[PDB]
Amino acid sequence: MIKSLFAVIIGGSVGCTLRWLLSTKFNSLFPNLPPGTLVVNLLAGLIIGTALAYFLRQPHLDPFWKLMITTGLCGGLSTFSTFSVEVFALLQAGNYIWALTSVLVHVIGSLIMTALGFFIITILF
Amino acid sequence: IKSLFAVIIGGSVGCTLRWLLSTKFNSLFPNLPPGTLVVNLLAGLIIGTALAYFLRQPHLDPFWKLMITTGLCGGLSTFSTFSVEVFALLQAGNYIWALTSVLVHVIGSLIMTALGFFIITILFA
Amino acid sequence: SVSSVPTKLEVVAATPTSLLISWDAPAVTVVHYVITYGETGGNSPVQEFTVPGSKSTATISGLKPGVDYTITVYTMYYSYSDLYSYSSPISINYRT
Amino acid sequence: SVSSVPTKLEVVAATPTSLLISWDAPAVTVVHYVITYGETGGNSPVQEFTVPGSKSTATISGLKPGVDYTITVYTMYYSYSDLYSYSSPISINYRT
Ligand SMILES: CCCCCCCCCCO[C@@H]1O[C@H](CO)[C@@H](O[C@H]2O[C@H](CO)[C@@H](O)[C@H](O)[C@H]2O)[C@H](O)[C@H]1O
Ligand SMILES: CCCCCCCCCCO[C@@H]1O[C@H](CO)[C@@H](O[C@H]2O[C@H](CO)[C@@H](O)[C@H](O)[C@H]2O)[C@H](O)[C@H]1O
Ligand SMILES: CCCCCCCCCCO[C@@H]1O[C@H](CO)[C@@H](O[C@H]2O[C@H](CO)[C@@H](O)[C@H](O)[C@H]2O)[C@H](O)[C@H]1O
Ligand SMILES: [Br-]
Ligand SMILES: [Br-]
Ligand code: NA
């Protein structure tokens, strides 16, 4: 399981760097709910939802690529820690209306990007 | 570019951790996969403590804050895996645990970040 | 590594034309169970249907009296390593 | 490329012993504002205090009547790129 490890690094590296580039360019535009950290979470949610309903239909794919996409890319692309500080900060700044809003959008949006990616591919097929 | 290595080396370790902890432990509690959670609480912890520390030491190299925050924590944590699980439970008509999983991840990760931050804050005093 | 296949597949109540089967859920987030039933002698269309993961019993109906049927049940489950996937089946035979 | 420093700092109301300052908040998430004020004349200890981030006005008291004070303001704010850091200050002079 060293081959297994390169899949995590390659995939995560992409997902991370990807997440890194997007957050710096776009997060500052709307601080009450930074959009960079939201798009990567919606994006991975979209991807993993598609990976869900496609992996299902391909039982004999290499455990290598499945790792590199989900654990690697989506795992490295999405973030939960960076989601927490932004809320913790909106809470220390007494911005409750937005702190609560940021929690809702991330959770639900991520599950809809998952529902979309799943049901788009379930429906194409 | 020097910043690029931080995200990579950082995210790589975090992703490699999220992987190992997720495989070895997730399969023990399907209603709430605990590997996807600890990585989250642990990253929420790290980021909270990182928050309060880099404040007191406001002049340290940006390289180390990057590797630890956007890398380590960003790589260690995950939102896609938290999504699929909840979506998987939602698909399985397991509404009770789908909700619980959502709460424990958020409430918990936020508590962990506050805990990480407030410990450090109380330390420097 | 934990197994994703049900266990203790068995007819708990039969009539001539219906079978009440039940099983025990695997230790995995099972999205839904698939039950397949056909006449043991490979001479009849095999029928399949789904039951929610929250259920561990199914009813097979329209059966012929006095005929041997092969009944099998597998899962479509979520696991960390494979996302969605189908389990290998657990089969039994039963004569109506 | 977004400034964390406040803008348009001015005294909106004054008494002989107290100044009332107002500022425009930066387009960042400010955790708290740090106000600093001291007699503009040399070695009077500069005093400082904080104001929550949701507020953008502050009162300063205990000042001697008819003295020029230096009033400065910066922020402890959150940015994705830096987490909790302190902003550059914005200063004005007002004489009671
Ligand atoms: C359900 C999930 C729970 C997870 C845990 C959440 C923990 C949140 C911690 C927030 O930290 C506090 O927030 C207060 C409120 O923002 C701040 O008050 C500051 O701001 C207030 C409002 O802006 C002022 O009234 C206060 O005097 C001033 O100290 C206070 O400093 C800060 O330490
Ligand atoms: C907070 C919002 C987050 C974003 C939205 C996420 C929505 C995710 C669930 C959608 O998937 C459906 O869920 C149904 C309920 O679990 C399943 O019903 C299945 O299971 C039911 C169990 O009662 C049966 O009654 C149905 O017939 C059977 O199709 C159904 O198959 C499944 O496709
Ligand atoms: C689920 C648990 C939820 C509750 C978590 C705790 C929330 C309440 C915190 C109370 O303690 C606070 O500690 C702050 C210091 O950490 C103080 O901040 C003071 O100093 C800060 C800087 O250290 C400034 O930003 C603040 O505006 C200023 O009020 C503040 O007075 C004090 O009351
Ligand atoms: Br982070
Ligand atoms: Br994932
Ligand atoms: Na991540």
Numbering used by the authors:
A (entry chain B): 1 to 125
B (entry chain A): 2 to 126
C (entry chain D), D (entry chain C): 1 to 96
Q: Which statements did the authors publish about this structure?
A:
Microbes are protected from the cytoplasmic accumulation of environmental fluoride ion (F-) by export of the toxic anion via fluoride channels known as Flucs. These small, homodimeric ion channels are remarkable proteins in two regards: first, their unusual ‘dual-topology’ architecture, in which the two subunits of the homodimer are arranged antiparallel with respect to each other, yielding a double-barreled pair of pores related by twofold symmetry; second, the Flucs stand out among anion channels for their extreme substrate selectivity. In contrast to most characterized families of anion channels, which tend to be non-selective among anions and sometimes poorly discriminate against cations, the Flucs are arguably the most selective ion channels known, with >10,000-fold selectivity against the biologically abundant chloride. The protein possesses two deep, aqueous vestibules with an electropositive character due to an absolutely conserved arginine sidechain and a deeply buried sodium ion at the center of the protein.
To test whether any of these densities might better be assigned as anions, we endeavored to crystallize Fluc channels with bromide (Br-), an anomalous scatterer. We were unable to generate diffracting Fluc-Bpe crystals in the presence of Br-, but we were successful in solving the structure of Fluc-Ec2 in the presence of 100 mM Br-. Anomalous difference maps show two prominent peaks, located in equivalent, non-crystallographic symmetry-related positions at the bottom of the aqueous vestibules. These densities are coordinated by a sidechain that is invariant among Fluc channels, Ser81, along with the highly conserved Thr82. In maps from previous Fluc-Bpe structures, a positive density occupies this same position between the homologous hydroxyl sidechains. This site is exposed to bulk water in the vestibule but is likely to be partially dehydrated, with aliphatic sidechains, including Ile48 in close proximity to the bound bromide ion. In order to test whether this anion-binding site is part of the fluoride permeation pathway, we introduced an I48C mutation to Fluc-Ec2 and assessed the effect of modification by a bulky, anionic, thiol-reactive reagent, (2-sulfonatoethyl)methanethiosulfonate (MTSES), on fluoride conduction. In planar lipid bilayers, I48C mediates robust fluoride currents, which rapidly diminish by ~50% upon addition of saturating MTSES to the cis chamber, consistent with full modification of a cis-facing thiol in a population of channels with oppositely oriented pores. One anion-binding site, identified by the anomalous diffraction of Br- in the Fluc-Ec2 homolog, is located at the bottom of the electropositive vestibule and is sensitive to mutagenesis as well as modification of a nearby sidechain with the bulky thiol-reactive anion MTSES. Taken together, these experiments show that the anion-binding site at the bottom of the vestibule is on the fluoride permeation pathway .
